[PDB]
Design an enzyme around this catalytic site. Sequence first.
Site, PDB file in Angstrom:
ATOM      1  N   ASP A 288      14.674  -1.665  13.524  1.00  0.00           N
ATOM      2  CA  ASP A 288      15.154  -0.499  12.795  1.00  0.00           C
ATOM      3  C   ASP A 288      14.140   0.640  12.810  1.00  0.00           C
ATOM      4  OD1 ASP A 288      17.258   0.918  11.559  1.00  0.00           O
ATOM      5  OD2 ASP A 288      16.694   0.250   9.553  1.00  0.00           O
TER       6      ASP A 288
ATOM      7  N   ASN B  15      11.566   5.207   8.467  1.00  0.00           N
ATOM      8  CA  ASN B  15      10.875   3.909   8.374  1.00  0.00           C
ATOM      9  C   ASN B  15       9.421   3.927   8.850  1.00  0.00           C
ATOM     10  OD1 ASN B  15      13.044   2.730   7.144  1.00  0.00           O
ATOM     11  ND2 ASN B  15      13.947   1.912   9.030  1.00  0.00           N
TER      12      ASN B  15
ATOM     13  N   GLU C 295       0.856  -1.174   0.000  1.00  0.00           N
ATOM     14  CA  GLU C 295       0.000   0.000   0.000  1.00  0.00           C
ATOM     15  C   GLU C 295       0.905   1.241   0.000  1.00  0.00           C
ATOM     16  OE1 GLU C 295      -2.143   0.895   3.630  1.00  0.00           O
ATOM     17  OE2 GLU C 295      -0.755  -0.291   4.804  1.00  0.00           O
TER      18      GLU C 295
END
Lengths: 297, 257
Positions: free
Chosen positions: A127, A132, A81
Amino acid sequence: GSMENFQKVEKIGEGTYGVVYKARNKLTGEVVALKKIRLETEGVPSTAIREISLLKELNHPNIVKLLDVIHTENKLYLVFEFLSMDLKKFMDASALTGIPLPLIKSYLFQLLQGLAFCHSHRVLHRDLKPENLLINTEGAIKLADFGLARAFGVPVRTYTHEVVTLWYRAPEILLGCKYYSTAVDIWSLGCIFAEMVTRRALFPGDSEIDQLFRIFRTLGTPDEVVWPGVTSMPDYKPSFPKWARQDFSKVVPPLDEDGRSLLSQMLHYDPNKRISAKAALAHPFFQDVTKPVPHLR
Amino acid sequence: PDYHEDIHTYLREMEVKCKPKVGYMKKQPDITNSMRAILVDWLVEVGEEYKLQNETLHLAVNYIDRFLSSMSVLRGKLQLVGTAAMLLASKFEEIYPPEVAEFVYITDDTYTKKQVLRMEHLVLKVLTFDLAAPTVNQFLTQYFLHQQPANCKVESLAMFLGELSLIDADPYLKYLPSVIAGAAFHLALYTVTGQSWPESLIRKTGYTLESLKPCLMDLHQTYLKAPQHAQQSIREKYKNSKYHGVSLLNPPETLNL
Ligand SMILES: Nc1ncnc2c1ncn2[C@@H]1O[C@H](COP(=O)(O)OP(=O)(O)OP(=O)(O)O)[C@@H](O)[C@H]1O
Ligand SMILES: [Mg+2]
């Protein structure tokens, strides 16, 4: 799903293997992100093996959705998405005016929901950082980039000693503890919480030792009182400077009482005492949380 | 502390979903339980040689049994399926998986590098990348938390017994990993300390000695007969001090069940 139904639009990032493209499904109109992974004569990268198998188990509003895996001879496309922006770009656009408190609180609440779900499904992210985390125009924020993630066991054993980009890396990784666990993701979220408020990184070191000393100067050098067993950790040195813990209201000055309380529990030295994502959902900081749209294009 | 119960609950749901077809060997025209036993025993040696985690071995066997639930394989190719499964499990589970050349090397050059890589891709397609499967190992380490006090020999012996169940599809394919772990934990506990499946694990798992009985009766026999079994790599492995030499402990003659 296959490549003929997708129309590439523009490059939106390059992790590795390496590019991520924005694209459009020609029959449904759905806008997607195509992560290409090039297939080294070493077969499918372990990072892709983990990323895909873990993503296929994680269906949650605050975790980026893997829609499909297009799976040919020399190429591997992951269809995700599409989300408008990453949190790092958003904070740059908010440079001068800053990010409204209700948005910060909404984003943290959602990140914690996302992470509690990961941890509940025995997944470590490893991470977490602003680039991110992806945001859309409706006010959602989602965990993305599971390339460093791993399925953990109960109790954990020793996993990869690298892990987490330095600025967001927990003290227990930095001090070389043989075992680390879900607490390392919380440490990263606490750093990001502070960063959304100040719009600069909380501990921007350039080496492991520099990173530790910045943490120590903010939170105080930990002793056996605050963190039992710390002085026996592998990379602990008795020559470490001993900094006093400063007034916690000075770490992120715009935060009021509830915000500070929550931040202090996410940045607790002992991973045992550090707050879980599940318990943090119920913190008084969230008593009045809403979900506003971002205030910007 | 946190998530231990959520994770357990989730693994119990997934183990039903990740379970191989109990009947699959009867649908395989060219391979047998005996051939599978030989393959699994070889994978144990590969794990020895490259010092792989036990978890890596259980994952690989799970990938093999699931692959073989939908794909007919000739006997000359069974070892290729096994090599690719072990490569995938290694990439999933290990901090330092061995390189692809190392996997080619230990099939004594029966196969080529290209074959191994093509089989890896095939196994991923057939499994649809669903690699994060629950294993006996993953249930055992949670059950170990309920010891009073922790006993290294009990842990090692439980892992040994869980590993022996991997070798024989008849009967072990019909039991869920959580059940095999329950039987292996009880049997280990009973062998070393004389103690029984703790009520604290009844609360957690919902399993009693009564509901573990069929699996336990099978495992007890497997244990008694282990020195006479045609595959011996697990017994050899569990002689090492790493596993506290538990394969040298005497099985009990009876269980009371
Ligand atoms: N679903 C998505 N929607 C929009 N943008 C995305 C999406 N996935 C990734 N991106 C963009 O591409 C960047 C890189 O993707 P990702 O972080 O998943 O892989 P990576 O290999 O870690 O790359 P990098 O190291 O550059 O972050 C992200 O920071 C993000 O800006
Ligand atoms: Mg990234």
